[PDB]
Design a protein around this ligand. Structure first.
Ligand code: 47A
Length: 330
């Protein structure tokens, strides 16, 4: 089997991407944030505290003939941005772009933090990291991908995020029309439950490539590119007027600037992030200070190849017995 679904930025900045997901019988379609940095499929639901729902589409398990309460199971998750959600668990039929999994754990939110409430476009998350991170207790649950794996033509999914445009998540096959050149594969460590890999270095604009190992995770659920302070300093040093602002919470730059590209290494291959991808617009409405799309990972504890990086590539998440990541230009 295979699946193919279009993923759409939630706003003009590509702050996140939503992908339609069919849950239950008859189908209830929710727009979920596919997140290769976490491993819970959770949704706004009929059980979510009413004051914490503001515009989201909710899953109502009582209206699904295939929904079954997973007795005694609860979940609770906190994300890197400080957001959180928790609730109980159903199993139900979940379909993504024609690919169907029965008995998928669908984690029903009883509580969500303010940032989720305030984002009316995201109805939940579909986690695509390794199932070892799944927060369901006392019986850990498998991700949609893990459940689908055996049925897939090939044990892979691919992320093809658009810049200010729709893109595609495919399951079970590699679309050879979707990228240019060849896909370069690189080793993955699953030890932290992430799609963790090691970039071979970077370049800023037309500058020389710096060969240096950068261990990080491929995370579709993180907006920006978070890299070591040395790297990030070297990037923003090429932008007149750019500075790290503690009040804003990162590097900002004059909105009048033209940003240089940023290249990262994948083995001997190179992925180029155009400068425009690194512009996240005025820090506040009407401001001439713009927020940078490349930020320091200092204090995070890990480097994160978020959407800013991933949307510059066709990315293969290879879930074979020994997982790997593949990157191609496009
Ligand atoms: N990885 C965390 C994530 O995907 C996320 C998405 C939307 C909000 Br609001 C907060 C967090």
């Amino acid at each position: 089997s295979t699946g193919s679904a279009t993923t759409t930025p939630i706003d003009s900045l590509d702050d996140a991407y939503i992908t339609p997901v069919q849950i239950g019988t008859p189908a209830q379609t929710l727009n979920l944030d596919f997140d290769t940095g976490s491993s819970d499929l959770w949704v706004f639901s009929s059980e979510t505290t009413a004051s914490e729902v503001d515009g989201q589409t909710i899953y109502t398990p009582s209206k699904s003939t295939t929904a079954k309460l997973l007795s005694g199971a609860t979940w609770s998750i906190s994300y890197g941005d400080g957001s959180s959600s928790s609730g109980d668990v159903y199993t139900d039929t979940v379909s993504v772009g024609g690919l169907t999994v029965t008995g998928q754990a669908v984690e029903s939110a009883k509580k969500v933090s303010s940032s989720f409430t305030e984002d009316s476009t995201i109805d939940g998350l579909l986690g695509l990291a390794f199932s070892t991170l799944n927060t369901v207790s006392p019986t850990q649950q498998k991700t949609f991908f893990d459940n689908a794996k055996a049925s897939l033509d090939s044990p892979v999914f691919t992320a093809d995020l658009g810049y200010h445009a729709p893109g595609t998540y495919n399951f079970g096959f590699i679309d050879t029309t979707a990228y240019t050149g060849s896909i370069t594969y690189t080793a993955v460590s699953t030890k932290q439950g992430f799609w963790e890999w090691t970039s071979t270095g970077y370049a800023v604009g037309s500058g020389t490539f710096k060969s240096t190992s950068i261990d990080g995770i491929a995370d579709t659920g993180t907006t920006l590119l978070y890299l070591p302070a040395t790297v990030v300093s070297a990037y923003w040093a090429q932008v007149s007027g750019a500075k790290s602002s503690s009040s804003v919470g990162g590097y900002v730059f004059p909105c009048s600037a033209t940003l240089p590209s940023f290249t990262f290494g994948v083995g001997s291959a190179r992925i180029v992030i155009p400068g425009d991808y690194i512009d996240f617009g005025p820090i506040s409405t009407g401001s001439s200070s713009c927020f940078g799309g490349i930020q320091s990972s200092a204090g995070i504890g890990i480097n994160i190849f978020g959407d800013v990086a991933l949307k510059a590539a066709f990315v293969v998440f290879n879930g074979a017995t020994t997982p790997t990541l593949g990157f191609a230009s496009k």
